[PDB]
């Protein structure tokens with residue numbers, strides 16, 4: 126029946142995506158962000174999810190971070206209610222609050238109720254870990270139609286199921302909390318995780334902490350051993366400044382960590398304005414980064430292949446935007462360029478969304494092709510399809526030819542557009558019709574009407590009929606196609622090729638084409 130949304134339920138951030146008109150689309154939360162902190166907080170008997178919970182993660186003791194780590198387990202998390210009593214919550218319930226939130230704002234964006242989803246998980250996850258994830262989904266009112274692996278999701282986003290050949294794919298996932306490297310074998314639509322290895326206590330958070338150590342060391346140096354470890358408001362601000370600094374060093378060779386009024390001492394207010402170079406940040410985080418090297422070789426050997434045999438490498442996780450990470454990965458797979466062309470923090474959700482569409486039935490797969498798959502033609506005298514843009518021409522393009530009138534004293538012309546490789550326009554699929562009058566009584570062949578088929582680089586078509594004498598010009602704009610639908614029309618022409626050529630004997634396109642008027 127209804128839409129099946131794609132959810133990446135991540136350790137540190139979550140992302141939600143859905144198929145819209147044959148494309149995956151990432152949905153943005155109410156704060157306009159395409160990803161959402163996997164963080165829940167409790168205050169005044171009100172549940173807070175995402176950015177607002179992250180903004181009080183150190184200050185509010187109730188905040189629950191990295192709940193995903195306790196999934197599958199029987200552990201509990203205790204939080205204070207308003208009255209001082211203690212409520213106890215399972216990892217299924219906390220995750221269900223995050224999923225409810227994602228589900229909520231998606232309904233508001235889509236404007237429909239949503240009750241089905243694909244949820245992704247780490248490849249290593251066992252059945253309890255997956256049943257807790259599935260139970261989270263049920264508590265949130267979502268029929269979980271399938272649970273898929275994060276790196277399998279990544280491969281669907283990159284259309285690797287469409288390769289029509291065996292593919293060895295290395296997926297390097299460095300998130301905020303977790304690192305995973307997986308080796309996939311993808312053959313005839315079956316996804317097999319040959320091998321997985323990594324560290325679920327290693328991620329971009331650990332990179333930030335080295336910046337917190339840096340800022341701390343600097344403060345102690347500058348202010349006679351000033352230590353703010355036990356100050357919650359201070360530590361909240363450092364954690365945030367650390368992550369801002371880190372992110373800026375993925376596009377800058379340095380940055381300024383700026384923390385005015387960090388605290389006040391008997392000396393007055395302490396202001397930090399601290400430079401951190403990319404070189405320095407890389408040095409401080411070298412130990413963390415290098416814990417990702419051996420795992421790459423480990424899974425390569427575990428699946429009994431050379432590096433040579435790897436067909437494609439995908440970068441997943443937002444921490445893979447870091448230059449040092451991209452460089453590392455490249456160093457371990459000579460020849461291959463790691464693929465980062467789909468937002469690594471969105472890529473998994475996108476894959477789930479694709480899987481969702483495929484499970485539904487509405488797999489109206491649009492294709493952003495740079496070349497025209499079929500001939501585009503105007504109907505001339507006798508129902509003949511005179512081509513203007515030939516099959517396999519590269520967009521953008523605008524071809525033009527002058528036509529005339531089929532009958533003497535003809536007041537107007539019908540501009541009937543059609544797509545396909547067949548000699549009669551009735552055989553081809555029509556894309557539109559429109560009229561153009563203003564035409565003065567004359568012999569057939571006298572009026573000179575410049576027709577212009579025009580395609581933008583995004584694909585869509587505009588056909589511009591112009592009477593050159595009277596300047597009168599009507600024009601229509603056109604919608605796109607499926608792969609099966611393309612192939613049906615190619616097949617149809619292939620199937621009637623003998624019939625069509627005998628029709629073509631009588632057709633002569635080298636003379637000026639003629640457009641007629643049949644009454645609407």
Ligand SMILES: Nc1ncnc2c1ncn2[C@@H]1O[C@H](COP(=O)(O)OP(=O)(O)O)[C@@H](O)[C@H]1O
Pocket residue numbers: 135136137138139160299300301302303328329330368371372373375441442443444445446447469470
């Ligand atoms: N431009 C960037 N440079 C460095 N790190 C980044 C950048 N953008 C996002 N990150 C980091 O990505 C990490 C995790 O992102 P994400 O993939 O959403 O995590 P997860 O999949 O674990 O939920 C965060 O620690 C964040 O600091």
